[PDB]
Amino acid sequence: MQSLSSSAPTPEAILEWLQKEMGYRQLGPYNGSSKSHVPSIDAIRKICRGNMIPIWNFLINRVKSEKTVERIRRNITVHGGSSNALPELRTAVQNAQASSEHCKYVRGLLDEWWEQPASTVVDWVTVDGQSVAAWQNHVKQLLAFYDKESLRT
Amino acid sequence: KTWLCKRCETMNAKLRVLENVLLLETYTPDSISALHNIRNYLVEATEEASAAYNKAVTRLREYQGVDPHFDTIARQYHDIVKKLENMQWTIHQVEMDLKSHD
Amino acid sequence: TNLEVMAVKEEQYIQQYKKYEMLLNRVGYTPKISHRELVEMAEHRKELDKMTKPVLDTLRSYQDLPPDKALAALAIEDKKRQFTAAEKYLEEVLQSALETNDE
Amino acid sequence: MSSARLCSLVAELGYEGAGKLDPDSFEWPFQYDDARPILDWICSSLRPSNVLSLAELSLYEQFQRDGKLLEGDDQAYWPLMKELDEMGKINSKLSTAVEEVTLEHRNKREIVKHHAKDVELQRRVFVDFFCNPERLRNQVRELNALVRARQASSS
């Protein structure tokens, strides 16, 4: 489920087929093959729609909740997103290069840019980044047009 | 040393947990173009200096044209100090041409 | 045992070194080699554009030769103009190239 | 029973607050309560969803919003002595370094929106006065005005 993104939806992908044929399997090895099944289910106002589906419908309100996390559980693994964007003396010395290293990392935090990431988590990265690229300048401009109608008047 | 470090690892892990995720989404769409847009500026200065050796070689080439003049003693006495000047004239022109490749 | 658990909580952090490397080797090498040369190029480009001016000063020191030669002043003049053309646009097109990377 | 059910369908956790005073508060739902078979059928299909509050279904929707798009509040916090002092000062700075980048992400994205409107509204001040006759002239300006803006955003 959470461990593998591809593992989680495969039970779900068959589930919409499964859930109805779970109703089609009761008292029959296969729905078409067994004559015993077709009396058990009712064409209208069936018993499964009476208790099992409402219990499932009760579940759906929580299933869609856990699926919502399950989609997140799948999404986190494929793409991780968190909050947007003598020897003892040597170990003390080793910390100095370690101290030298984070300042490079601190510098490496803004070396590519300090104006773009700080002023924009996502400007050209996949989510909405192509959208500003698709439009002339930036997706904010639509928030700038509706008052242009008031500007021209 | 056991307590002083592996709090070392606490820092380095915090030094990694955001570093890997933040950089990956940022540089990768722009990493290949990041070097190139200087490389195109690097090669244009490089090719200009290559012709600039050629122009310097042209100054060596015109010295081959100075050789028919160099036989005449009157301008040769001028030429030899001018060739000494030309020798010196190369360096400031060459130091233009040397680092422009770089 | 919390400190030992914190130590156990350290042999959870010592393995995202072993989770991120498949992207970190892409992160640790290419951005670093790219940035370091440009930073070295930053001082180097600052020295690249500059020595023209001392050479303009040094060309005055050797100004005697070009008039004496049949033609020596034109050769240095035109190559500087192409160099001047290099800083003439002054990354304005490169900004547009940088614009495509930025958005 | 079914009289309170239509009052119960709107929400369940918030219901008990009024649920005690409700049966005294209302009497008219008892009339369609008496018609159990008709009301039960429509309720029975709907009661799985109605037990869930209308706010609660939004709570499951914002669970998707919580992950990777969380707008809620964000938190931003002798020789071996020298290594202790080094570890002491570096971890705070490195925490600061990782907290400052998280201190910003709440307002990171909006900054380009912030400085753009500050440019945008400033021009809008005088154009709002007289723009009726010349709009095609004006629509030319907004094309290259953002050219300056995108230069600032890229810089």
Side-chain angles (χ1 to χ4, degrees), chain B residues 25-45:
Chain B
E25 268 66 11
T26 53
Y27 79 86
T28 57
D30 303 336
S31 44
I32 51 172
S33 63
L35 190 49
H36 287 110
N37 51 61
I38 297 90
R39 294 297 189 192
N40 64 17
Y41 178 74
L42 182 64
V43 300
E44 63 89 30

mmCIF file of all heavy atoms in Angstrom, chain B residues 25-45:
data_model
loop_
_atom_site.group_PDB
_atom_site.id
_atom_site.type_symbol
_atom_site.label_atom_id
_atom_site.label_comp_id
_atom_site.label_asym_id
_atom_site.label_seq_id
_atom_site.Cartn_x
_atom_site.Cartn_y
_atom_site.Cartn_z
ATOM 1 N N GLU B 25 14.051 19.111 -7.485
ATOM 2 C CA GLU B 25 12.975 19.721 -8.257
ATOM 3 C C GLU B 25 13.424 21.027 -8.904
ATOM 4 O O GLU B 25 12.859 21.457 -9.916
ATOM 5 C CB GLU B 25 11.753 19.945 -7.365
ATOM 6 C CG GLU B 25 10.755 18.787 -7.362
ATOM 7 C CD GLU B 25 11.305 17.510 -6.744
ATOM 8 O OE1 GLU B 25 12.389 17.550 -6.124
ATOM 9 O OE2 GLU B 25 10.648 16.458 -6.882
ATOM 10 N N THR B 26 14.443 21.676 -8.334
ATOM 11 C CA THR B 26 14.846 22.987 -8.836
ATOM 12 C C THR B 26 15.865 22.873 -9.965
ATOM 13 O O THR B 26 15.650 23.410 -11.059
ATOM 14 C CB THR B 26 15.403 23.847 -7.700
ATOM 15 O OG1 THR B 26 16.444 23.137 -7.020
ATOM 16 C CG2 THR B 26 14.301 24.217 -6.716
ATOM 17 N N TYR B 27 16.994 22.203 -9.719
ATOM 18 C CA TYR B 27 18.084 22.272 -10.689
ATOM 19 C C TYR B 27 17.805 21.407 -11.914
ATOM 20 O O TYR B 27 18.129 21.805 -13.037
ATOM 21 C CB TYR B 27 19.418 21.881 -10.038
ATOM 22 C CG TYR B 27 19.651 20.396 -9.862
ATOM 23 C CD1 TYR B 27 20.198 19.633 -10.886
ATOM 24 C CD2 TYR B 27 19.362 19.764 -8.665
ATOM 25 C CE1 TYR B 27 20.419 18.284 -10.732
ATOM 26 C CE2 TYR B 27 19.579 18.416 -8.501
ATOM 27 C CZ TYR B 27 20.111 17.681 -9.538
ATOM 28 O OH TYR B 27 20.332 16.335 -9.381
ATOM 29 N N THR B 28 17.201 20.231 -11.723
ATOM 30 C CA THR B 28 17.048 19.294 -12.837
ATOM 31 C C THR B 28 16.335 19.880 -14.054
ATOM 32 O O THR B 28 16.790 19.606 -15.179
ATOM 33 C CB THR B 28 16.358 18.002 -12.366
ATOM 34 O OG1 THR B 28 15.086 18.293 -11.774
ATOM 35 C CG2 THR B 28 17.227 17.255 -11.373
ATOM 36 N N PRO B 29 15.252 20.660 -13.935
ATOM 37 C CA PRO B 29 14.694 21.270 -15.152
ATOM 38 C C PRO B 29 15.629 22.279 -15.798
ATOM 39 O O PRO B 29 15.459 22.606 -16.979
ATOM 40 C CB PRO B 29 13.400 21.927 -14.649
ATOM 41 C CG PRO B 29 13.661 22.199 -13.224
ATOM 42 C CD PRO B 29 14.443 21.015 -12.753
ATOM 43 N N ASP B 30 16.614 22.783 -15.055
ATOM 44 C CA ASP B 30 17.489 23.844 -15.534
ATOM 45 C C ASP B 30 18.968 23.474 -15.503
ATOM 46 O O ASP B 30 19.797 24.286 -15.921
ATOM 47 C CB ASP B 30 17.270 25.114 -14.703
ATOM 48 C CG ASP B 30 15.828 25.583 -14.723
ATOM 49 O OD1 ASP B 30 15.101 25.243 -15.678
ATOM 50 O OD2 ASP B 30 15.423 26.295 -13.780
ATOM 51 N N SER B 31 19.319 22.277 -15.022
ATOM 52 C CA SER B 31 20.729 21.938 -14.835
ATOM 53 C C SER B 31 21.478 21.880 -16.160
ATOM 54 O O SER B 31 22.586 22.417 -16.277
ATOM 55 C CB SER B 31 20.856 20.605 -14.099
ATOM 56 O OG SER B 31 19.956 19.644 -14.625
ATOM 57 N N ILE B 32 20.895 21.227 -17.167
ATOM 58 C CA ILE B 32 21.579 21.089 -18.451
ATOM 59 C C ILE B 32 21.775 22.452 -19.103
ATOM 60 O O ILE B 32 22.845 22.748 -19.650
ATOM 61 C CB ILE B 32 20.811 20.114 -19.365
ATOM 62 C CG1 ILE B 32 19.333 20.501 -19.460
ATOM 63 C CG2 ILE B 32 20.959 18.685 -18.862
ATOM 64 C CD1 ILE B 32 18.561 19.703 -20.494
ATOM 65 N N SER B 33 20.752 23.306 -19.050
ATOM 66 C CA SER B 33 20.862 24.631 -19.650
ATOM 67 C C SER B 33 21.716 25.562 -18.795
ATOM 68 O O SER B 33 22.228 26.573 -19.292
ATOM 69 C CB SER B 33 19.469 25.218 -19.867
ATOM 70 O OG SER B 33 18.790 25.390 -18.637
ATOM 71 N N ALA B 34 21.869 25.247 -17.506
ATOM 72 C CA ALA B 34 22.630 26.119 -16.614
ATOM 73 C C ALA B 34 24.078 26.250 -17.062
ATOM 74 O O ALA B 34 24.637 27.354 -17.065
ATOM 75 C CB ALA B 34 22.568 25.594 -15.179
ATOM 76 N N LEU B 35 24.707 25.135 -17.432
ATOM 77 C CA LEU B 35 26.077 25.194 -17.924
ATOM 78 C C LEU B 35 26.134 25.754 -19.338
ATOM 79 O O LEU B 35 27.023 26.548 -19.663
ATOM 80 C CB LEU B 35 26.709 23.805 -17.878
ATOM 81 C CG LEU B 35 28.214 23.748 -18.146
ATOM 82 C CD1 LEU B 35 28.944 24.781 -17.307
ATOM 83 C CD2 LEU B 35 28.756 22.351 -17.891
ATOM 84 N N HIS B 36 25.183 25.360 -20.191
ATOM 85 C CA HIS B 36 25.277 25.670 -21.614
ATOM 86 C C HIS B 36 25.267 27.173 -21.867
ATOM 87 O O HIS B 36 26.033 27.672 -22.699
ATOM 88 C CB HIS B 36 24.129 25.001 -22.374
ATOM 89 C CG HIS B 36 24.279 23.518 -22.523
ATOM 90 N ND1 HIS B 36 23.477 22.617 -21.855
ATOM 91 C CD2 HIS B 36 25.138 22.778 -23.264
ATOM 92 C CE1 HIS B 36 23.832 21.387 -22.181
ATOM 93 N NE2 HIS B 36 24.838 21.457 -23.033
ATOM 94 N N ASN B 37 24.405 27.912 -21.166
ATOM 95 C CA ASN B 37 24.251 29.332 -21.468
ATOM 96 C C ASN B 37 25.503 30.124 -21.105
ATOM 97 O O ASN B 37 25.642 31.289 -21.497
ATOM 98 C CB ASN B 37 23.008 29.890 -20.772
ATOM 99 C CG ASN B 37 22.964 29.567 -19.298
ATOM 100 O OD1 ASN B 37 23.835 29.963 -18.539
ATOM 101 N ND2 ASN B 37 21.931 28.841 -18.883
ATOM 102 N N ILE B 38 26.423 29.525 -20.344
ATOM 103 C CA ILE B 38 27.759 30.103 -20.247
ATOM 104 C C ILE B 38 28.679 29.482 -21.295
ATOM 105 O O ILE B 38 29.561 30.153 -21.848
ATOM 106 C CB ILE B 38 28.340 29.959 -18.826
ATOM 107 C CG1 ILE B 38 27.515 30.706 -17.776
ATOM 108 C CG2 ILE B 38 29.750 30.498 -18.777
ATOM 109 C CD1 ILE B 38 26.423 29.899 -17.168
ATOM 110 N N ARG B 39 28.481 28.192 -21.592
ATOM 111 C CA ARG B 39 29.316 27.509 -22.579
ATOM 112 C C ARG B 39 29.219 28.176 -23.946
ATOM 113 O O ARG B 39 30.230 28.329 -24.641
ATOM 114 C CB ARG B 39 28.920 26.033 -22.676
ATOM 115 C CG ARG B 39 29.210 25.222 -21.424
ATOM 116 C CD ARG B 39 30.700 25.156 -21.114
ATOM 117 N NE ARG B 39 30.986 24.207 -20.043
ATOM 118 C CZ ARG B 39 32.151 24.110 -19.417
ATOM 119 N NH1 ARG B 39 33.179 24.875 -19.743
ATOM 120 N NH2 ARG B 39 32.288 23.220 -18.437
ATOM 121 N N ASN B 40 28.010 28.578 -24.354
ATOM 122 C CA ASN B 40 27.869 29.330 -25.598
ATOM 123 C C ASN B 40 28.607 30.662 -25.522
ATOM 124 O O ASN B 40 29.154 31.136 -26.524
ATOM 125 C CB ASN B 40 26.385 29.525 -25.928
ATOM 126 C CG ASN B 40 25.643 30.372 -24.898
ATOM 127 O OD1 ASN B 40 26.245 31.075 -24.091
ATOM 128 N ND2 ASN B 40 24.316 30.291 -24.922
ATOM 129 N N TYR B 41 28.625 31.284 -24.340
ATOM 130 C CA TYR B 41 29.427 32.488 -24.153
ATOM 131 C C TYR B 41 30.911 32.149 -24.066
ATOM 132 O O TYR B 41 31.766 32.968 -24.420
ATOM 133 C CB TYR B 41 28.973 33.237 -22.899
ATOM 134 C CG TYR B 41 29.785 34.480 -22.605
ATOM 135 C CD1 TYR B 41 29.633 35.628 -23.371
ATOM 136 C CD2 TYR B 41 30.706 34.503 -21.565
ATOM 137 C CE1 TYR B 41 30.374 36.766 -23.109
ATOM 138 C CE2 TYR B 41 31.452 35.637 -21.296
ATOM 139 C CZ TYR B 41 31.281 36.765 -22.072
ATOM 140 O OH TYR B 41 32.019 37.897 -21.810
ATOM 141 N N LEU B 42 31.234 30.949 -23.580
ATOM 142 C CA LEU B 42 32.632 30.542 -23.491
ATOM 143 C C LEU B 42 33.220 30.269 -24.871
ATOM 144 O O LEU B 42 34.356 30.662 -25.159
ATOM 145 C CB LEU B 42 32.764 29.309 -22.598
ATOM 146 C CG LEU B 42 34.187 28.798 -22.367
ATOM 147 C CD1 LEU B 42 35.009 29.837 -21.624
ATOM 148 C CD2 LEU B 42 34.169 27.483 -21.608
ATOM 149 N N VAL B 43 32.463 29.589 -25.736
ATOM 150 C CA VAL B 43 32.990 29.211 -27.046
ATOM 151 C C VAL B 43 33.136 30.431 -27.948
ATOM 152 O O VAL B 43 34.059 30.502 -28.768
ATOM 153 C CB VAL B 43 32.113 28.118 -27.691
ATOM 154 C CG1 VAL B 43 32.082 26.878 -26.811
ATOM 155 C CG2 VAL B 43 30.702 28.627 -27.941
ATOM 156 N N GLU B 44 32.231 31.408 -27.824
ATOM 157 C CA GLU B 44 32.312 32.584 -28.686
ATOM 158 C C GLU B 44 33.556 33.407 -28.374
ATOM 159 O O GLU B 44 34.179 33.973 -29.280
ATOM 160 C CB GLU B 44 31.041 33.430 -28.563
ATOM 161 C CG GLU B 44 30.776 34.031 -27.192
ATOM 162 C CD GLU B 44 31.417 35.395 -27.014
ATOM 163 O OE1 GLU B 44 31.563 36.122 -28.020
ATOM 164 O OE2 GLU B 44 31.774 35.740 -25.868
ATOM 165 N N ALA B 45 33.933 33.489 -27.096
ATOM 166 C CA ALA B 45 35.208 34.106 -26.745
ATOM 167 C C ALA B 45 36.373 33.220 -27.169
ATOM 168 O O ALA B 45 37.446 33.719 -27.526
ATOM 169 C CB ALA B 45 35.261 34.389 -25.245
#
